[PDB]
C-alpha cells in the first residue's frame, strides 16, 4: 500500500525541468507554461497504492496562500521553510515574489538572505528589525486596500496580470511572504506582533500578502490564525493528539528521519533539499545552499527585493516638515509604526515633559522644539524664557523672542517672580461668557514659553519654579507653556513634587528615553528601558504610546 521508506531525499533540480539562465527571468525554467503561476514543488509524496512517488506541489494562488508548518524538535521544520522559499525563487523573479523572515528557529534562514527575492532576515536579537519588518508589511496591506479601489484592481490576479505586461509600476511589490520560524518565540517576546500578523493573515491574502508560519505544535497557534493557514504541512509530532490530519496516522510517523510528514489528506510526503546541484546527502547541506543562492543571484541582474526601512541612528532635522507645510504644529520626529512625522501642538496641549538618562538627547530635543517655535512664531506672538543652569540652550536663546535667561538659582527666582505676577494678571475674572473664555478676549498679548532643561537640579528643597505650580492647570486661559526635561535619577519619586505632579495630571504630552526599569512607569503605560540616542516612547493619551525617533539639530 505505502511505498518502502526512501533512503535519500530528492533535490529541487530532480523535481524541476532543465533549468537555464534567462534574459531576464533569472535562473529558471526558461519558457515553461507553469513558470510564475505561484505553484511550488516542495518534495515527493506517496499516495496510497502508488508504486512510484509523485512530485509534491503546492498552489499558493488563492485560499491556500497561507502556509503552516508544525513538528517537534529537529523534525525538519526550518529546512521546509528554506525549501519553499528556494522553490518559489527558482520558478519566479524577485519582482514577482518577496520574502521577509523572522527567524526564531536556529537562525538558519540567514543563508538565504543574499537571495534577490529576500529583503530581510531577523535573528532573535534584532528586535528593532523584527518589530519594523512586520510593520512594513502591515503598512503595505493598508496601502493596497486603497490602491486597488482607487484604480481598476478588482482581484489580486488582475494585479499580477498588469505587472505581467512589464508596463505597470504598481506599488513596487509583487507577492509578499512574511515568514516566521518559531511562532511561540514571537508571541512570547513580541505579544503585540501576534495580533498584528494575525490581522495580516485575515484580509491580506486577497491583496498578495502571505504568511508562512512555523512552530513546534499546532496548539501554539491561536484559533484565530491557525484556521487561516490554508496549507498545512505537518511533520513528526510529539503528542500526536493535536494533529490536524489524524492522531493514529501521526503516531506511526517515522522518528529520526526528518523531512517525513503528513498532508491534510493523509498522504506520506518527504521534504526535498534546497539544492540544485544533485547531492542527495544532508551533511553537505550548508554548502549546497550557498551554491544555489549564488547561482540565483548571479543570473539576476535586475531590481532586488525592497528592504525593511529601519529607524535611522541619526535623523536629520532638515527632513521634518517645514513651517510652511506643518503650520503651528511642530514636528519632533518620526514613529516606528509608519515612519510618519510626529507633531506637537501647543494650541491643543500647553505643556510638555521629557525623561531621559545621561546623554540620551534631552538638551538636543529642547533646542529642536525651541527652534521650531522660533520658526513658527513672531516674537510678538510668542516670547521665550530659559531656565538653563548647565547653559546648554545657548544656540537658541539669542533670538529676539528671548526675554529671560536664568543660568543660576538666583536668576531663576528673579524671573519666576516677574512671571507669576505677569501671568496672574491674565487669570480669568469670575463673570465671563463661554465665548470670552474660548477666544481669550479679556487679555491681549503674546504666549509665554518657559523652557527648563535639567529640572533635576532646579528642583531642590527650595524649587524656584514652585510658585508657578498653582497656576499651571490654568495655562489654557492665560497662554502659559512649560517645556521641561529631567533625568531618570529619582524620577519616580519626582512625580509627586508640586510641578511634575500637576503637569502629569493634565495628561500632558511627553516621551521617555533610555531609562532604567528600576524607576517604574513615568508617563502612560511604558516602563523605561535602555534606548538608543534620540529614541523614546512618545506618550500621548489621544494616540496612546508610540515609539518614535527624534531629530538631530546641528550645533
Amino acid at each position: 500500500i505505502w511505498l518502502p521508506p526512501l533512503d535519500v531525499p530528492p533535490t529541487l533540480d530532480e523535481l524541476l525541468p532543465p533549468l537555464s539562465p534567462s534574459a531576464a527571468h533569472g535562473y529558471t525554467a526558461d519558457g515553461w507554461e507553469w513558470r510564475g503561476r505561484l505553484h511550488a514543488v516542495v518534495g515527493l509524496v506517496d499516495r496510497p497504492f502508488d508504486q512510484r512517488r509523485d512530485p509534491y506541489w503546492l498552489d499558493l494562488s488563492g485560499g491556500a496562500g497561507h502556509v503552516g508548518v508544525a513538528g517537534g524538535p529537529q523534525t525538519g521544520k526550518s529546512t521546509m521553510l528554506r525549501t519553499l522559499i528556494t522553490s518559489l525563487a527558482l520558478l519566479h523573479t524577485p519582482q514577482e515574489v518577496q520574502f521577509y523572515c523572522l527567524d526564531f528557529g536556529g537562525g538558519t534562514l540567514a543563508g538565504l538572505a543574499e537571495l534577490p527575492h529576500v529583503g530581510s532576515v531577523a535573528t532573535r536579537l534584532d528586535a528593532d528589525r523584527i518589530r519594523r519588518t512586520v510593520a512594513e508589511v502591515s503598512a503595505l496591506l493598508e496601502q493596497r486596500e486603497q490602491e486597488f479601489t482607487e484604480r481598476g484592481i478588482d482581484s489580486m490576479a488582475t494585479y499580477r496580470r498588469l505587472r505581467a505586461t512589464g508596463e505597470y509600476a504598481g506599488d513596487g511589490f509583487g507577492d509578499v511572504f512574511l515568514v516566521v520560524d518559531n511562532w511561540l518565540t514571537l508571541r512570547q517576546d513580541y505579544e503585540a506582533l501576534e495580533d498584528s500578523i494575525t490581522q495580516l493573515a485575515a484580509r491580506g491574502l486577497g491583496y498578495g500578502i502571505h504568511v508562512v508560519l512555523s512552530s513546534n505544535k499546532w496548539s501554539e497557534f491561536r484559533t484565530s490564525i491557525r484556521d487561516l493557514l490554508g496549507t498545512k504541512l505537518e511533520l513528526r509530532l510529539g503528542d500526536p493528539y493535536e494533529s490536524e490530519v489524524d492522531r493514529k496516522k501521526a503516531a506511526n510517523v517515522p522518528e529520526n528521519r526528518p523531512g517525513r510528514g503528513l498532508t491534510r489528506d493523509g498522504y506520506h510526503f518527504l521534504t526535498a533539499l534546497p539544492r540544485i546541484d544533485g547531492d542527495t546527502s544532508a551533511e553537505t547541506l550548508t554548502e549546497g545552499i550557498a551554491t544555489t543562492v549564488k547561482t540565483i543571484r548571479e543570473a539576476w541582474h535586475g531590481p532586488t527585493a525592497p528592504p525593511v526601512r529601519m529607524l535611522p541612528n541619526v535623523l536629520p532635522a532638515a527632513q521634518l516638515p517645514s513651517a510652511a507645510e506643518s503650520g503651528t504644529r511642530i514636528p519632533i520626529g518620526i514613529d516606528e509604526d509608519s515612519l510618519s512625522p510626529v507633531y506637537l501642538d501647543f494650541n491643543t496641549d500647553p505643556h510638555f515633559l521629557v525623561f531621559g538618562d545621561t546623554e540620551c538627547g534631552k538638551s538636543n530635543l529642547l533646542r529642536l522644539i525651541t527652534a521650531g517655535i522660533i520658526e513658527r512664531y513672531t516674537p510678538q506672538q510668542a516670547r521665550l524664557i530659559f531656565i538653563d543652569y548647565s547653559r546648554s540652550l545657548l544656540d537658541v536663546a539669542t533670538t529676539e523672542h528671548q526675554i529671560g535667561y536664568a543660568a543660576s538659582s538666583t536668576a531663576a527666582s528673579s524671573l519666576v517672580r516677574d512671571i507669576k505676577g505677569a501671568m496672574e494678571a491674565r487669570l480669568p475674572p469670575p463673570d465671563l461668557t463661554p465665548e470670552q473664555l474660548r477666544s481669550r478676549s479679556w487679555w491681549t498679548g503674546a504666549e509665554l514659553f518657559l523652557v527648563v532643561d535639567d529640572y533635576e537640579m532646579v528642583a531642590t528643597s527650595d524649587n524656584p519654579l514652585r510658585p508657578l505650580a498653582e497656576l499651571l492647570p490654568q495655562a489654557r486661559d492665560i497662554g502659559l507653556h512649560l517645556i521641561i526635561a529631567r533625568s531618570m535619577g529619582g524620577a519616580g519619586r519626582a512625580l509627586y513634587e508640586p510641578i511634575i505632579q500637576r503637569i502629569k495630571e493634565m495628561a500632558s504630552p511627553g516621551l521617555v528615553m533610555s531609562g532604567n526599569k528600576d524607576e517604574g512607569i513615568l508617563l502612560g503605560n511604558v516602563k523605561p528601558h535602555k534606548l538608543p540616542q534620540g529614541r523614546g516612547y512618545f506618550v500621548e493619551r489621544r494616540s496612546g504610546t508610540r515609539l518614535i525617533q527624534t531629530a538631530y539639530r546641528e550645533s
Binding site: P379, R383, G421
Partner: peptide, 7 residues
C-alpha cells in the same frame, strides 16, 4: 505687555 515687563 510681557515684552516690557521682564526687561
Amino acid at each position: 505687555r510681557v515684552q516690557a515687563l521682564l526687561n
